Design a protein around this nucleic acid. Structure first.
Ligand SMILES: [Mg+2]
Lengths: 83, 97, 94, 110, 83, 97, 94
DNA sequence: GTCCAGGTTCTCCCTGTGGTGAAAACCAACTAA
């Protein structure tokens, strides 16, 4: 199923609100075309590592431990969902 | 009456460093995964605890990026982050080759 | 079927140093998955300590070296001495 | 016929984490071929010291913000408050936590 | 055996020459008290992990594969000496 | 005759990015390990391929540090590295807690 | 005693694509230790693929997934198809 | 100093989560060699 224009779903306040959690007061208007780029790099290195686990067990559902196993691979461990 | 610039901003920093809420909303982040997954294998399903395993891992990366971005902006005698900071934030950690 | 866990054995530690304290469901799973991860770091470094010294045997010496590697500084001083109490108490029994 | 009283090996060492369950997770995890009888004793103690040390610190942050139960925010905040607990989990995201409250003291208002 | 004043053995040109390999043209005079600090942090996290291997086999010589096993642990693999 | 500042310096960058030699010498780095090893266990021996396993790993870290230091110095509109750069280089990677 | 190695099997690959080329001693040990490291990454990810799917068996399917994880991009396209030739040639024999 | 804005505390009602009590299931420990 194909639904495009959804890198533009990461809206303009929801990058500002993520900026405020990092402790950032004033931002530019050109982070919005940088953040959406660095985000899709990070999801093209997790979903590419997650699907090769789900294809390997011949599952059609990328389950909760799969993503945690992908994040185990990169060296960014996620607790709380298992694994 | 009229706030100065940097007053409503600093109210946001102590606000969002206290809550645990979702900042990136669900459905405009769930559909982002339905773009990258289409290349590697079409017709995949996702458990909602696995999408949420990404919504709490992508927000675990940008906040880890912006807090390491804002070190650079302060470092150049500024208080404003710029996209020359992020592209030099990532080159130091090795998060982009 | 059966999912083994460490959830029950947290309440037997939570009610040791904070006896008037509950713990939520989604915070149990962190201390659940803290255990399973810190399990296989210590085991999976004691495992690779067996090949490095050509033995097929995980002793209770090899778990001690695979805790002085993973734990840094002041945890490596306590969690060693918090194990050798529980072994010397164990072996004097039975 | 009957047999003696089955005394568990977790009660023969004064621990709370089991040793019977740990000793079949060293022979079904392919860590090595032989696993000593004292090794899952010694490992269930180190699993028990470190399970206290988070929950000791997770009890305080629950108390300092007037809570009965420990939600993951406290586990998020008990970690990264202690220094040596943070250096163990320096790479590790905890789910549903957010970060510590932090300002670099240059963004303070003028 | 005790030989002190040997964090001062990392001399002033030999930090400049390491700076030139990184592609650095102009340096300050206050890197020299920073580099010797960051260096001894890195050798108090390798020798502390190397000696626990050599003590474990009850060897008195920290051999070549020991250090490589310590650098295996941190996630900085060293080829060329074995392991 | 008289070189300008930045000319003999740039001769060094293309020089040392070509060779494979040892920059930190052997004996003033071998004795550095005879200070840190004395704490954890006195009277240890070292194989010379293990000291060299450190002399090619410590030089593998500073060069990885200074090349990520010099990104910051260029980032603050400068060409000079400073010890506020390194202490902010290491905080981004997480190499110091 | 005996140190097993991959040094001999480099000359049987070096003399395949550069037949007029020698190789030094201290550069052999890199391509020696390149192999032993890239061995246990692929094995040690196929190993942990056995536990994740509850099988005691390393098949030749599990080595294929533990090469599509470690090798990035265009090496993951060739080294898969440079293995399935050497298996289909192998199984049609014997 | 002064006025107000957005916040923090206190209380009351409501819900969801947790801590537990009871059966089943399975593993751990004991026994004989
Ligand atoms: Mg008989």
């Amino acid at each position: 199923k194909v639904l495009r224009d959804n890198i533009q779903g990461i809206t303009k306040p929801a990058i500002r609100r993520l900026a405020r959690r990092g402790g950032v007061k004033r931002i530019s208007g050109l982070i919005y075309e940088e953040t959406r780029g660095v985000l899709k790099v990070f999801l093209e290195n997790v979903i590419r590592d997650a699907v090769t686990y789900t294809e390997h067990a011949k599952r059609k559902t990328v389950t909760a431990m799969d993503v945690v196993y992908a994040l185990k691979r990169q060296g960014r461990t996620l607790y709380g969902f298992g694994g | 009456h009229r706030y100065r610039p940097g007053t409503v901003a600093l109210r946001e920093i102590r606000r969002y460093q206290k809550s645990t809420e979702l900042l990136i909303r669900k459905l405009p982040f769930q559909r982002l995964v339905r773009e990258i997954a289409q290349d590697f294998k079409t017709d995949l399903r996702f458990q909602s605890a696995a999408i949420g395993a990404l919504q709490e891992a992508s927000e675990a990366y940008l906040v880890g990026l912006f807090e390491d971005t804002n070190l650079c902006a302060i470092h150049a005698k500024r208080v404003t982050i710029m996209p020359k900071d992020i592209q030099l934030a990532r080159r130091i950690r090795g998060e982009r080759a | 079927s059966r999912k083994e866990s460490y959830s029950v054995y947290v309440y037997k530690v939570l009610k040791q140093v904070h006896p008037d304290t509950g713990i939520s469901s989604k915070a149990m799973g962190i201390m659940n998955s803290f255990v399973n991860d810190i399990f296989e770091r210590i085991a999976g470094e004691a495992s690779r300590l067996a090949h490095y010294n050509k033995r097929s045997t995980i002793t209770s010496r090899e778990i001690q070296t695979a805790v002085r590697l993973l734990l840094p500084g002041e945890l490596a001083k306590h969690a060693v001495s918090e194990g050798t109490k529980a072994v010397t108490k164990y072996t004097s029994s039975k | 016929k009957a047999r003696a009283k089955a005394k568990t090996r977790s009660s023969r060492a004064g621990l709370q984490f089991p040793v019977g369950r740990v000793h079949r997770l060293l022979r079904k995890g392919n860590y090595a071929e032989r696993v000593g009888a004292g090794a899952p004793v010694y490992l269930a103690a180190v699993l028990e010291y470190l399970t206290a040390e988070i929950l000791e610190l997770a009890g305080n942050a629950a108390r300092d913000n007037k809570k009965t139960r420990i939600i993951p925010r406290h586990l998020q905040l008990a970690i990264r408050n202690d220094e040596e607990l943070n250096k163990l989990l320096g790479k590790v995201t905890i789910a549903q936590g957010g970060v510590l409250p932090n300002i670099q003291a240059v963004l303070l208002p003028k």
